[PDB]
């Protein structure tokens, strides 16, 4: 019936297309440090952030989740200006970025797992900070080809609040690995497969792979559309070949796309090198409706199977 | 004749009696996640930070170095509210805790060193973030058993940014390892052996270790007294015993001590278990004062050396 925004409760069917992974504002963990050089400047990344919001909003897009973690810049109060400023629905996430000395430490007093649930849970109930805002996701990672100790504290910790609220997970995975071991481990402790997005599955390239990872009954994303030469990720050429394999093969009802667009960088600008600046030029909020889904339309893909994927799916998905 | 303190510029003469290294408030790099559970309370923090400090001016002291890293809740403006409540002058760091992704991605860039150089520079010179306040120190670690590129690249950085400002450099050695080496690659690159301090070396219990690190002319620092019960770290009674080795061989001029304790803790509170507590007992800002100095002048050392340590070695160091 109802999913947390970061404006509060909104009926699931009032979603609409959605953007199922998008970033308004991100920072690798160690931004903080650079602070002196690189100062968060609320007006100017306040207009940036809503100009990507009605680039969206031009779309027909209505919803955006913004799964950015809690060390990473997730700013819910911000989140909300951009939201109050657009009609946007945003659902922000709990969790951490892709161990961290804090809980290297917690890990010695032995109760890092259940400080995590308690983390999870608050979130998800309470609210983040003391903004009221509540996240509507929780937000997970693995290692590339290992889904370490430490990684599945919180695989565990996410599965127990998953229970408890009935919350959608939506996890990162490294380089096209562990998909499958993702799936098995939150259903292996109970999480519901139905509520559980495995992310990044673009970043491989072998359908078998993904039909692997889809007899679990979760969700896939092809989540990162424009990111191209870096990471090793392929390229959206690549992406589409795949995409269309699993198209072809009807798994539509399982399937979401999104960019990962980072649309304000934290700490320090920088600007990429002249090889990567180029192969990464489409890597903004409008390159799907510009670029990838006429491509899927001259490949046969009907508009039906579209809206499954972004209206369809994310309904049924937080529902 | 001057040091920034959180205050501005003090004469290095008005120093006095120092405690080399303490933290008003600290947190492992990670804690910023935990913000919800982990909330940082002003008014409670800024009364507990200003009686620890009461309780440091109770034994004479008149200055603190503070080399909390840049991630771990550095906040100049709170300890110049501390430093203004007590009259304490307060010495701050600029630098990281002991690769975080936002450094592997400017690496990447290929402008991490200039980039890391740039931020010790304008928090020494020109302010941290808008608070006017200019670190007093650089702060700088290494892994145990090896200094990495990584680590070695913030140690360049340091000793460009030493060469220009006269600033001094501390650094974090890990479990008695990497003293010497670290002596030698900062003055390998310019550094001046008077504005060393090499850390934690009393985490290593090998006389022949530290009469190495000494051979380089820089300071060492015996700054984790009080911190006792992981197997295999060193005890405080192991602490005193190879200090008096060292100010039997007349040492005393390269000598400084400390607690490194962390007064306020960020993130979520906790407790440590019953027995590593007990161990732990000893670890405030008064044990050297209460503790250690009076066993060492029952070792026969004498108030000039003392006096030596705590007042004349900061003195020297800092002009
Ligand atoms: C430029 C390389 C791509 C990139 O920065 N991805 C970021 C976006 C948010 O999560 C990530 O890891
Ligand atoms: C409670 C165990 C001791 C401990 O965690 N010390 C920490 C605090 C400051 O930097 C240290 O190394
Ligand atoms: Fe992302
Ligand atoms: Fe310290
Ligand atoms: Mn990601
Ligand atoms: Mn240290």
Same mark, same amino acid.
């Given at each position: 019936?109802?999913?947390?925004?970061?404006?509060?409760?909104?009926?699931?069917?009032?979603?609409?297309?959605?953007?199922?992974?998008?970033?308004?504002?991100?920072?690798?963990?160690?931004?903080?440090?650079?602070?002196?050089?690189?100062?968060?400047?609320?007006?100017?990344?306040?207009?940036?952030?809503?100009?990507?919001?009605?680039?969206?909003?031009?779309?027909?897009?209505?919803?955006?989740?913004?799964?950015?973690?809690?060390?990473?810049?997730?700013?819910?109060?911000?989140?909300?200006?951009?939201?109050?400023?657009?009609?946007?629905?945003?659902?922000?996430?709990? *969790?951490?970025?892709? $161990? %961290?000395?804090?809980?290297?430490?917690? @890990?010695? #007093?032995?109760?890092?797992?259940? /400080?995590? &649930?308690?983390?999870?849970?608050?979130?998800?109930?309470?609210?983040?900070?003391?903004?009221?805002?509540?996240?509507?996701?929780?937000?997970?990672?693995?290692?590339?080809?290992?889904?370490?100790?430490?990684?599945?504290?919180?695989?565990?910790?996410?599965?127990?609040?998953?229970?408890?609220?009935?919350?959608?997970?939506?996890?990162?995975?490294?380089?096209?690995?562990?998909?499958?071991?993702?799936?098995?481990?939150?259903?292996?402790?109970?999480?519901?497969?139905?509520?559980?997005?495995?992310?990044?599955?673009?970043?491989?390239?072998?359908?078998?792979?993904?039909?692997?990872?889809?007899?679990?009954?979760?969700?896939?994303?092809?989540?990162?559309?424009?990111?191209? *030469?870096?990471?090793? $990720? %392929?390229?959206?050429?690549?992406?589409? @070949?795949? #995409?269309?394999?699993?198209?072809? /093969?009807? &798994?539509?009802?399982?399937?979401?796309?999104?960019?990962?667009?980072?649309?304000?960088?934290?700490?320090?600008?920088?600007?990429?090198?002249?090889?990567?600046?180029?192969?990464?030029?489409?890597?903004?909020?409008?390159?799907?409706?510009?670029?990838?889904?006429?491509?899927?339309?001259?490949?046969?893909?009907?508009?039906?199977?579209?809206?499954?994927?972004?209206?369809?799916?994310?309904?049924?998905?937080?529902?």
């Amino acid at each position: 019936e109802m999913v947390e925004t970061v404006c509060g409760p909104v009926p699931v069917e009032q979603l609409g297309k959605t953007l199922i992974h998008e970033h308004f504002l991100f920072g690798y963990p160690g931004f903080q440090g650079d602070v002196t050089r690189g100062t968060f400047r609320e007006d100017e990344s306040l207009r940036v952030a809503v100009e990507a919001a009605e680039k969206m909003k031009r779309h027909g897009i209505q919803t955006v989740v913004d799964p950015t973690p809690n060390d990473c810049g997730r700013n819910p109060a911000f989140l909300r200006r951009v939201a109050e400023e657009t009609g946007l629905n945003i659902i922000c996430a709990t *969790g951490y970025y892709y $161990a %961290p000395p804090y809980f290297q430490f917690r @890990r010695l #007093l032995g109760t890092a797992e259940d /400080d995590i &649930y308690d983390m999870f849970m608050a979130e998800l109930t309470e609210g983040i900070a003391d903004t009221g805002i509540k996240a509507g996701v929780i937000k997970l990672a693995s290692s590339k080809g290992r889904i370490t100790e430490y990684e599945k504290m919180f695989f565990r910790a996410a599965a127990r609040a998953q229970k408890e609220t009935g919350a959608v997970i939506i996890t990162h995975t490294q380089e096209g690995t562990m998909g499958p071991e993702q799936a098995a481990y939150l259903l292996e402790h109970g999480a519901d497969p139905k509520k559980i997005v495995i992310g990044h599955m673009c970043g491989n390239t072998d359908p078998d792979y993904h039909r692997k990872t889809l007899a679990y009954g979760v969700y896939i994303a092809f989540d990162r559309f424009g990111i191209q *030469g870096m990471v090793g $990720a %392929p390229t959206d050429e690549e992406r589409v @070949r795949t #995409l269309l394999a699993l198209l072809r /093969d009807g &798994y539509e009802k399982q399937i979401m796309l999104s960019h990962n667009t980072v649309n304000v960088w934290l700490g320090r600008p920088f600007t990429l090198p002249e090889p990567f600046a180029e192969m990464m030029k489409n890597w903004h909020v409008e390159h799907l409706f510009v670029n990838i889904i006429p491509a899927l339309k001259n490949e046969g893909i009907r508009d039906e199977v579209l809206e499954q994927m972004f209206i369809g799916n994310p309904a049924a998905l937080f529902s």
